[PDB]
Amino acid sequence: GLGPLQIWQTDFTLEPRMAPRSWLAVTVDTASSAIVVTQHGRVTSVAAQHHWATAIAVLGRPKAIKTDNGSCFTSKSTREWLARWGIAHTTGIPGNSQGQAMVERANRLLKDKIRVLAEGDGFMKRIPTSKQGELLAKAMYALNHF
Amino acid sequence: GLGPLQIWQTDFTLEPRMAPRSWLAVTVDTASSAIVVTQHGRVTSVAAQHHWATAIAVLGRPKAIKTDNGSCFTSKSTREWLARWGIAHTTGIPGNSQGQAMVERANRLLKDKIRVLAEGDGFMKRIPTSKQGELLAKAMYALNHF
Ligand SMILES: [Ca+2]
Ligand SMILES: [Ca+2]
Helix, strand or coil, rough: CCCCEEEEEEEEECCCCHCCCCCEEEEEEECCCEEEEEECCCCCCCHHHHHHHHHHHHHHHCCCECCCCCHHHHHHHHHHHHHHHHHEEECCCCCCCCCCCHHHHHHHHHHHHHHHHHHHCCCCCCCCCHHHHHHHHHHHHHHCCC | CCCCEEECCCCCCCEEHHHHCCCCEEEECCCCCCEEEECCCCCCCCCCCCHHHHHHHHCCCEEEEECCHHHHHCCHHHHHHHHHHHCCCEECCCCCCCCCHHHHHHHHHHHHHHHHHHHHCCCCCCCHHHHHHHHHHHHHHHHHHC
């Protein structure tokens, strides 16, 4: 009962191998280190809400989420969506510096796993679109379980 | 170490509120009762592999999966995909009768939660396409956590 708080860190990261939906939305559960990733065609507020809808189904509802001040995260729409769910939102400190370091380490382990699985399949450039889906699933698998 | 075996039961179920991608692929982890659902436009073998790719990222790799003899599940393609992952597959007994009862109970709790959340939003018929995604996320959330 003295366990970790259910706080998430989310961010978006660009990955051209995953084009056209090359914007990967990544969420790290700081309680368990689990990771949830979704792809999007454009960074929008709505992209951020859809990514969270999916992470919540997978991780359960957090008590809070930390993001940077990107505008897709502090727009009105996003504040209202998070309010409707009852989740608190913080963008940390104005000149944070650090503080979002797990989601950033996550971003880097993820892109690396994607490159190594993609190349294992013989794709050295963009991944065929029909194949990105299982590859992105496979990457997430590899970083969360086995 | 005497805990339950990681065996899944998967099935596809039709849901017109979710049209055009009205075929919902549902997987129950018989170890934890967690549920994973994905939508598809057509019931194909490939639909079954994509659904599992996503469930594995979410639940980890099972030791076995039980399905009925639908052809999308015993086709060559599907047998080879499951073989590549190292998961055993069984379709149970020829005139099983029961044995897939959790995935079927799941199918029914799911469609019911979708109807009640959809109607809470004022959609009494098909759900606008742009809205199905979070609604399907929301349903899964409700049946797995809170
Ligand atoms: Ca950012
Ligand atoms: Ca069936």
